[model samples]
Target chain A: GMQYIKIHALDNVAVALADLAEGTEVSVDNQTVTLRQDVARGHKFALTDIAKGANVIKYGLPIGYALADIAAGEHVHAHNTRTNL
Target chain B: GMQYIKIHALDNVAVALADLAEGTEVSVDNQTVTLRQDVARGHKFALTDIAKGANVIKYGLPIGYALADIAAGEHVHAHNTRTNL
Candidate 1:
């Protein structure tokens, strides 16, 4: 069973505080999601498909802007999100 | 201008993420202080005066625990932290 996936909010990114591998099953918003990439601790993943140039939300606010089209479950960081805060 | 404070090291727990007040200033293991309240952001504090239960660092390690006297910037979470992770 998926026990450690946290979708803090609908608009925010999901963080894998613990290690997670590709194809690992995780439930979010009550739905099962398979990780597409290995996510390290402290990093964030897109909860939904975000268009290029759109803002990447986390902590329920715009922590950064997406530098490119961000697929769900994809890792996000300085390369894709720009944080002014 | 005292830019963001983030001591991600030996003793993790310096995250005034953004809003800071109550004397302002701000420095580090490098030295300096003043602000003793109003700390919001990723939320985490207690660089000193941690005892009784011990264990309440951040990113560097541990997450919560401090059911007693905890000075230094104060304002931890879960009414004195206690992260099982």
Candidate 2:
């Protein structure tokens, strides 16, 4: 099995890319997180805890920042994170 | 600095996701490959060699498959690969 990472390192969040439902598996490094909800396109999820204004990552790169407090495994997006750049 | 990857582990090819001009530096685990050509969003790049009919990976998952003999570092896409499932 191949390892697919969610965040870009500098990013505080990640996307599913494709539809993933509850119980669906996604791996980061060697850890797997079975999704708890359906994650849609362009939506974000927290790879780690993120405070407001924290950078979001994808492929280990920073693309945006969190707008609110985020728990690991929580869904992140425009509702939780606001883009500054 | 963040490291952004191009291909998903299962993906036979990868997209630039953004515009990347020649000489732009990209790192994959300490090894950096500068672009030889301009890469645009959704356009593909080669990450591995794939035989015809091989499954393509994205985020380490199969999204499509290769339709031709693909060389490493060569672009992969609909022209070079045809999805079978």
Candidate 3:
């Protein structure tokens, strides 16, 4: 079953299709990353390392900025993200 | 400040910009509705009464189908909706 979905080809994040516990492995774009923390269903996870203050790309657009450096597989949401709008 | 925003002119629902208590009034398309239930921030509410099995429109498109008859001002989300996807 699909564990997550990336909305667009350019997206660097994917939304978890189910709750992902710490250490759960997820594959994207032929690469895999293991979750470092529990990720809620419908929440996003970094598909690539994202620098602090850099745009968090999703749906092929900048949805927000990382509040801190975000490593692949790290949970991404309001707590660690700041919207441009 | 805007309390809610309709992403498209034809949208039949608007996303709440903040938490809305039951009995709170919200205006959309020149009509106002008194919420029937508390709605979490970022959730959606009906701009018009939605009949059972009808599309739950958002951003001017069908995001899901009403799982039950949904009244105007009623909260709309997974609990009362079924996705076409």
lDDT of 1 by residue, A1-85 (tens): 2334342354546766567787776778866666778876656676778788887765454656888888877877777777655
lDDT of 1: 0.64
Query: What is the C-alpha lDDT profile of model 2 across B1-85, one tens digit per residue?
Result: 2223554444545566666666676665445555555555445666656777777666655657777876655556567776432
Candidate 3: stretches off by over 4 Å: B1-85
Q: Pick the candidate with the highest lDDT.
A: 3
Q: Rank the candidates by lDDT, best first.
A: 3, 1, 2
Q: Candidate 3 lDDT, tens digit per residue, A1-85? A: 4677775577788877677898999877888888988987667888889999998875455767899999988999888999653
Better of 1 and 3 by lDDT: 3
* Candidate 2 DockQ, CA atoms: 0.11
**Candidate 3 lDDT, B1-85, residue by residue in tens:** 4677665566667777677899998876777888999886667788889989998765445657899999999988888888653
Output the TM-score of candidate 2. 0.46
Interface RMSD of each: 6.8, 6.6, 8.6
Rank the models by DockQ, top first: 2, 1, 3
lDDT of 2 at A34: 55
- Model 1 agreement with the true structure over B1-85: per-residue lDDT tens digits: 2234443455535656566666676668775545567766645566666774887755454555678877766766667767644
- Candidate 3: which pairs clash? none
The candidate that wins on TM-score is 1
Cα lDDT for residue B50, candidate 2: 71
What residue runs in model 1 are displaced by over 4 Å at the alpha carbon?
A1-7, B1-20, B23-71, B74-85
